[PDB]
Design a protein around this ligand. Structure first.
Ligand code: SF4
Lengths: 182, 54
């Protein structure tokens, strides 16, 4: 476990930079590829489009986030209905066996780079129905989950905090910079 | 006296009065000449509306 620095330590330290990669690149190609990754991540970070799967009980919070108290399009997030145009999927609610193939199908019909947020306990690990004959214990067993938002349901603040955490993950992803090594 | 007999009336009554290998084969005499249509099965379109649907 680590802890935040103290006031004087902050005073010594410089600006934390903007691109999470930093600005230590050696050669022209390195420095150039650093910027292009930064632009790409900036695009994919600023504009992110959930699919609004929202099966149950959790869905109500998935709507309150769209509501005008913790506005989410403020951050550049919009609910596109069509999975071909949706970039992110907030799986929320329980995943019953009847639904499992449906979720799988919806997921891979969506084009990548696709990130999944598992909202609520029901999706995270099956939640409160974990020992049930009809529920997928978690949603990790159908799809690759990216961010877990604990809660039952998570308070709207918690959900969109997780969204920002996804934005941070979208910010630090290294595709061009490290293709250069590939 | 000979009168027109069923043999004489069978001289005609084919699709061709001099039946051949094909006309004699298939015959379509709907006497009324007004054949009713026979209803078909017009299968409809299927939509799996939902679940992924607002
Ligand atoms: S995790 Fe909680 S809020 Fe979400 S669907 Fe299950 S019971 Fe409802």
């Amino acid at each position: 476990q680590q802890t935040l620095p103290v006031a004087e330590v902050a005073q010594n330290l410089p600006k934390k930079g903007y691109s999470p990669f930093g600005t230590k690149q050696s050669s022209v190609a390195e420095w150039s590829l650093a910027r292009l990754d930064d632009l790409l991540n900036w695009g994919r970070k600023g504009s992110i489009w959930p699919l609004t799967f929202g099966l149950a009980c959790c869905a109500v919070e998935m709507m309150h986030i769209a509501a005008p108290r913790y506005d989410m399009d403020r951050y550049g997030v919009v609910f596109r209905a069509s999975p071909r145009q949706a970039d992110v999927i907030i799986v929320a609610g329980t995943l019953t066996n009847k639904m499992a193939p449906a979720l799988r199908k919806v997921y891979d019909q969506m084009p990548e780079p696709r990130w999944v947020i598992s909202m609520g306990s029901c999706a995270n690990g099956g939640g409160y129905y974990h020992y049930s004959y009809s529920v997928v214990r978690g949603c990790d067993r159908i799809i690759p989950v990216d961010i877990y938002v604990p809660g039952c349901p998570p308070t709207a603040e918690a959900l969109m905090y997780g969204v920002l955490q996804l934005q941070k993950k979208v910010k630090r992803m290294k595709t061009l910079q490290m293709w250069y090594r590939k | 006296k000979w009168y027109p007999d069923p043999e004489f009336m069978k001289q005609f009554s084919g699709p061709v009065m001099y039946p051949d290998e094909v006309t004699s084969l298939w015959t379509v005499p709907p006497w009324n000449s007004k054949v009713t249509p026979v209803e078909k099965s017009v299968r409809n379109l299927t939509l799996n509306f939902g679940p992924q649907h607002p």
